């Protein structure tokens, strides 16, 4: 027990989501579309294909003209729509994707040919006008999270500037008088500032804009002055600065009093990251969000992936920001804790076995196990039960995904 009530793991999560806004929209060029959500429906401007296109390449033919040897009056090549008009007794050369010439009924295959090896059937391998997409049909629904394939669409249709929810710019700082820039030669009594690097990287991996607020000391003055630049510059401020005992308030005091922010929770029943701190602040309608994560560089990653990310997603108007949780077999025996544990691990789907194996990377410090694969997901161990004390190799556990799996 501290000045703050211990918040349920689930309650903490559901709070961060519920409290988080959704940003406004923006018009962006479809090329910048990648990983965004559509704040508009998108409708076809014209048919596609806009002309009957040839599935095969050979000869565009009249069905009522049937078999036999016929005289050709020209070519149709992919690029241009034909001038020449097919009349009873003629024929035209084609290409796969070349427009069918005004007068033709169907087309001819390869070893089926002007010599003609025939057994006629109308509509023979022609892509009918508007067969893929019809003028005015909706092609991308409002709220769609755009992949490359979607940009493809956006291009196809010819919609080049779309309304999309804006990405949230995220400002990140680190508190502590004991930190130096990883460049700077290690002076006495100082450690290097590890988290800011990891966090800025962790969120950029998702492709949100970052604002590096640097190292700020463990003192209310410079502390607030940062938080200020934060709110002024960005939509989310993240703080990585071990605030657990004796001076846990230092930061919380500043939000609570100077900033007039509302701490939604200050401690959470989880391992690691007990001292995690959410918060909101409304300055002229705009609701800013503030995570204050612990200092333990492992915690800092774990919590960030459990709270910040889900919140950042919700913020860009992702519909279901809940993180993908897959089932996986444990790779080593684990001692369960009174509180719910989260362990970075590496998911591996072995060459046929239906479930993937998950092996932890470490508990504390740096890393227990060394690998060339990077932390795939993080492992969701449950609280220890009156019945359950430890999980054994092979047992099937929850793993939240945290990177290109």
């Amino acid at each position: 027990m501290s000045p703050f009530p211990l918040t349920s793991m689930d309650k903490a999560f559901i709070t961060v989501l519920e409290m988080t806004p959704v940003l406004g929209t923006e018009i962006i060029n479809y090329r910048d579309g990648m990983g965004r959500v559509l704040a508009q429906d998108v409708y076809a401007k014209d048919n596609l294909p806009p002309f009957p296109a040839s599935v095969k390449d050979g000869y565009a033919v009249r069905a009522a003209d049937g078999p036999g040897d016929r005289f050709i009056i020209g070519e149709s090549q992919a690029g241009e729509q034909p001038t020449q008009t097919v009349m009873p007794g003629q024929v035209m050369r084609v290409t796969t994707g070349a427009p069918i010439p005004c007068g033709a009924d169907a087309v001819v295959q390869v070893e089926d040919t002007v010599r003609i090896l025939v057994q006629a059937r109308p509509g023979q391998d022609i892509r009918p006008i508007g067969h893929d997409i019809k003028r005015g049909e909706c092609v991308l629904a409002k709220g769609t999270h755009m992949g490359p394939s979607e940009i493809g669409l956006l291009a196809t249709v010819g919609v080049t500037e779309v309304e999309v929810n804006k990405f949230p710019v995220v400002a990140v700082m680190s508190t502590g008088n004991e930190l130096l820039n990883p460049e700077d030669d290690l002076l006495p009594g100082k450690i290097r500032d590890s988290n800011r690097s990891t966090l800025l990287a962790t969120i950029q991996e998702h492709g949100y804009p970052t604002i590096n607020l640097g190292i700020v000391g463990d003192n209310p003055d410079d502390l607030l002055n940062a938080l200020n630049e934060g709110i002024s510059r960005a939509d989310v401020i993240i703080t990585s600065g071990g605030v657990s005992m004796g001076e846990k308030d230092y930061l919380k005091q500043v939000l609570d009093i100077d900033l007039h922010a509302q701490i939604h929770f200050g401690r959470v029943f989880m391992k690691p990251g007990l001292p995690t701190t959410f918060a909101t602040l409304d300055i002229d309608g705009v609701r800013k969000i503030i995570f204050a994560l612990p200092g333990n560089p492992v915690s800092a990653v774990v919590t960030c992936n459990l709270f910040v990310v889900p919140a950042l997603r919700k913020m860009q108007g992702i519909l279901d920001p809940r993180p993908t949780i897959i089932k996986a077999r444990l790779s080593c025996d684990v001692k369960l804790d009174p509180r719910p544990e989260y362990h970075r691990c590496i998911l591996t789907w072995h060459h046929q076995e239906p479930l993937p194996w998950a092996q932890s990377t470490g508990n504390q410090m740096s890393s227990r196990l060394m690998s060339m694969r990077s932390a795939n997901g993080l492992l969701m161990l449950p609280p220890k039960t009156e019945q359950y004390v430890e999980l054994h190799k092979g047992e099937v556990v929850d793993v939240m995904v945290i990177g290109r799996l």
């Binding site: 969701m380 449950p382 609280p383 359950y388 047992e395 099937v396």
Partner: peptide, 5 residues
């Protein structure tokens, strides 16, 4: 195994 998530 017990869930939790």
């Amino acid at each position: 195994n017990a869930a939790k998530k």
